[PDB]
Each structure stands twice: as structure tokens, then as C-alpha cells.
Design goal:
Blueprint lengths: L6 E9 L3 E8 L4 E9 H6 L3 H11 L10 E6 L3 E6 L7 H8 L4 H19 L4 E2 L7 E3 L5 E3 L4 E2 L7 H4 L8 H15 L9 H9 L11 H10 L10 H6 L1 H6 L8
Antiparallel strand pairs: 1-2, 2-3, 3-5, 4-5, 6-9, 7-8
Helix pairs in contact: 4-6, 6-8
The chain binds ligand MPY.
Family: Belongs to the protein kinase superfamily. Ser/Thr protein kinase family. Aurora subfamily.
GO molecular function: ATP binding; histone H3S10 kinase activity; molecular function activator activity; protein heterodimerization activity; protein kinase activity; protein kinase binding; protein serine kinase activity; protein serine/threonine kinase activity
Protein name: Aurora kinase A
Length: 256
């Protein structure tokens, strides 16, 4: 039974489309965490209010070192409050901008961490959508934390494009791992182009190239993940066992 009065609210940590995050200390436990304030109006304006309610619900049952922890949540007339884990090292995206690009060990380790977390959710019948660097936070020990809340558990007149979206949902994160792996090593997304339109075509036609410095092991893994056909994409287990990942990762791969 939470209330804003239960916290000592400190400095802002970021502003988003739907809300703001602040650093906070729980008066009771003198425990440092992050308070996310979401504006119901913004959520409704985008028709995601009902969606979030369900995602937060799923999250409250997820417990994993590489998934940003949701300690609880509450609300009032116009706000939704999320009591979240405080990740002191910022986002992966920020870190990547700071270093330009990651080496193989850093990259492989992050990929393993994501795969381990996704693998765990899979075993709880929970699926994840696309993953962006902007939604990955870093813990004090440098561990990555999935922090978006993209979780989830007629047809006759719909065309492939509108249908293929709602099917093979369990293969979307695999494509994302491939994109993240490429960006971590190269410094830019593989389908980044000049225009909104150009980017579409690149992704759709699955056309991209590897800079010379990208080793063979990494090209193999990325190429297997970035396949147009979702069923052609490997299983999370295959990622966790890929020679390049196990060789370079410093974090033990733990499937399921
Ligand atoms: C703003 C709301 C929002 C919208 C969309 C996506 C996200 C996920 C990142 C969020 N944030 C969110 O949920 N948040 C939950 C969070 C959270 C954000 C967070 N930490 C930080 O944002 C942060 C930023 C900079 C930082 N630095 C320290 C070292 N450097 C010297 C300078 C920088 C250290 C920590 N911990 N839990």
C-alpha cells in the first residue's frame, strides 16, 4: 500500500515522453531506488494506458539480475508511479556514445546478459518485443538491465505485412540481439540510412555490410540473427552457446 509520502524524493534522472524519473530513498528501509512518474494523460493520448497496466503486472512477477527490478507501483487521479531499481551507471546507449564502440568482450558479455534474461522470461511464458540501447541500464557492477517494459504473455482479409507482425512474436528479440550486437561492435545500427524511407527498405530487404574490423565469429552470429524469416533465426540457447559468445563473454551463459 504505497504512497508518495513513503519516499524522500531527490534529483531528476531523466524526462521521457510519458513521464519523469527521480532518485529516491524509501523512508522505511533507507533504500535507494528510482521513482518513475507517468502521466495518465500522456498514456491515454497514445492509447497505451491499458497496455502498461498489463506490462507492469507481468513485470511484478519477473525477478532477474539483468531485468530492471520493479519493487512495486501505485497511482492517483492523474499519475501512475513505478518504484524501480536504481541503475547508477546510466544507459548502454550513453556508454556507447562515450566509447564510440565496444570491444568483443564487452559486446559478448552484454549479449549473454540479454539472452540469459530473455531465456528466463521464455521459461515463464513471457515474451519481449524489440530492444533499444536507450532502454538498457547499467548496474553498479556494469551489468546490463532491460528497462523498457515490453513484456507480454478476422485474419482472412489481413495481408502478410499486417499479420506477420502478430505472429512469430518470440523471434523479434532475436533480431534485436543481432542489431544490438552489430551496433555495439560497429558504433551504428546496420540499417541506419539517410531518410526514414531509406531505413525501411534496408531493414525490409535485410541489406547491410560489415566493417573490415568485425571478426568472423561476430559476423557469423549477427548474420544468423538478422534473417528476414523469423523461423530462420536461432533459439536463445543457440546464441548462448555460440562459439564467439562463449569465447568472448566474461559472464556465464545460463539458458532457461
Ligand atoms: C525518463 C523515463 C524513461 C523513459 C524511457 C526509457 C527509460 C529507460 C532508460 C526511462 N528511464 C527509467 O525508467 N529509469 C529507471 C532508472 C533510471 C532511469 C536509472 N538511472 C539513470 O537514469 C541514470 C542516468 C545517468 C547516470 N549518470 C551517472 C554517471 N555519469 C557521470 C553521468 C550520468 C546514472 C543513472 N535507474 N533506474
Amino acid at each position: 500500500q504505497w504512497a508518495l509520502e513513503d519516499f524522500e524524493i531527490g534529483r531528476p534522472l531523466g524526462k521521457g515522453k510519458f513521464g519523469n524519473v527521480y532518485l529516491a530513498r524509501e523512508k522505511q528501509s533507507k533504500f535507494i531506488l528510482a521513482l518513475k512518474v507517468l502521466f495518465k494523460a500522456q498514456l491515454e493520448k497514445a492509447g497505451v494506458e491499458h497496455q502498461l497496466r498489463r506490462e507492469v503486472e507481468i513485470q511484478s512477477h519477473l525477478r532477474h539480475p539483468n531485468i530492471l527490478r520493479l519493487y512495486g507501483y501505485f497511482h492517483d487521479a492523474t499519475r501512475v508511479y513505478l518504484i524501480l531499481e536504481y541503475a547508477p551507471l546510466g544507459t548502454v546507449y550513453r556508454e556507447l556514445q562515450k566509447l564510440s564502440k565496444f570491444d568483443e568482450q564487452r559486446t559478448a558479455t552484454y549479449i549473454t546478459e540479454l539472452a540469459n534474461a530473455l531465456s528466463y522470461c521464455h521459461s515463464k511464458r513471457v515474451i519481449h518485443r524489440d530492444i533499444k540501447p536507450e532502454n538498457l541500464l547499467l548496474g553498479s557492477a556494469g551489468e546490463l538491465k532491460i528497462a523498457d517494459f515490453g513484456w507480454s504473455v478476422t485474419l482472412d482479409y489481413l495481408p502478410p505485412e499486417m499479420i506477420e507482425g502478430r505472429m512469430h512474436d518470440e523471434k523479434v528479440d532475436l533480431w534485436s540481439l543481432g542489431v544490438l550486437c552489430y551496433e555495439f561492435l560497429v558504433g551504428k545500427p546496420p540499417f541506419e540510412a539517410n531518410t526514414y524511407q531509406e531505413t525501411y527498405k534496408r531493414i525490409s530487404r535485410v541489406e547491410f555490410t560489415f566493417p573490415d574490423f568485425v571478426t568472423e565469429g561476430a559476423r557469423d552470429l549477427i548474420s544468423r540473427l538478422l534473417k528476414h524469416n523469423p523461423s530462420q533465426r536461432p533459439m536463445l540457447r543457440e546464441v548462448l552457446e555460440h562459439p564467439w559468445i562463449t569465447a568472448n563473454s566474461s559472464k556465464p551463459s545460463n539458458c532457461q
